[PDB]
Each structure stands twice: as structure tokens, then as C-alpha cells.
Design a protein around this ligand. Structure first.
Ligand code: NUA
Ligand code: CL
Length: 115
């Protein structure tokens, strides 16, 4: 069901290695709906190539646009299982401290802060 369930550790590591070779300026991001979520739609895909200069605040605006949300739908984004301490950090920094051992950056979204 979830990305980590669908692909082996060996498979995830090799995909990250091919993104490094072919999209060297991009952060490989896995974005998933909270298994509890009722209100927000599911995304059209799971694996995202995010330009490494964008900060978390802009990435939240990107995903809100992808979901086609309006001004007063709530949207919370967990990185590596937890709240972002700051939305102003460049995703290249966030990656180095929050990356998985397979080399993806894992994010989860919901309409409640309580996931
Ligand atoms: C080759 C696959 N690919 C993916 C993108 N863009 C994204 O994933 C979006 C996240 C913000 C831009 C471009 N090419
Ligand atoms: Cl690139």
C-alpha cells in the first residue's frame, strides 16, 4: 500500500542513485496522505523531484496547488514523521538532516495537526 511496502530497500536505493545521475539538482521526495485522512484528495503521484533551492514554505504552497485547495482548507505536512521546526530552511539543508537511509525524503500530509 505505502511506497516502502511497494518497493524493496534495494529498489529505493537504486532509484535514488538514478535521480542523482539524471536529476542531480533535484531532491527526491515521497509525499503520501495520512492513512487516517478523509478531507484532502490523494495526489496524482508519490515520487516528486523538488528543486533543491526551494524552502519548506514554498514546498507547502506547491503541494496546496497540486491538491487544488482553497484559502480555508487546512493542510499540515510532516517531514520524516514529525512537525517542521522551520518552513524557511532550504530543502537541500532539510534533506541532509531528515533523509531516510534509502535516500528519499518522506513527507505525509493531513487536514489536522493531530495525525
Ligand atoms: C522526471 C520526473 N519529474 C518530476 C518533476 N517535477 C516534480 O516532481 C514536481 C515537484 C515540484 C515539481 C519533473 N520531472
Ligand atoms: Cl537536475
Amino acid at each position: 500500500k505505502t511506497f516502502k511496502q511497494r518497493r524493496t530497500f534495494e529498489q529505493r536505493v537504486e532509484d535514488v542513485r538514478l535521480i542523482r545521475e539524471q536529476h542531480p539538482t533535484k531532491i527526491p521526495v515521497i509525499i503520501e496522505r495520512y492513512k487516517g485522512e478523509k478531507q484532502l484528495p490523494v495526489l496524482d503521484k508519490t515520487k516528486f523531484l523538488v528543486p533543491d533551492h526551494v524552502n519548506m514554505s514554498e514546498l507547502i504552497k506547491i503541494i496546496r496547488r497540486r491538491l487544488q485547495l482553497n484559502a480555508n482548507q487546512a493542510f499540515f505536512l510532516l517531514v520524516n514523521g514529525h512537525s517542521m521546526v522551520s518552513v524557511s530552511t532550504p530543502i537541500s539543508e532539510v534533506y541532509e538532516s531528515e533523509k531516510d537511509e534509502d535516500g528519499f525524503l518522506y513527507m505525509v500530509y493531513a487536514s489536522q495537526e493531530t495525525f
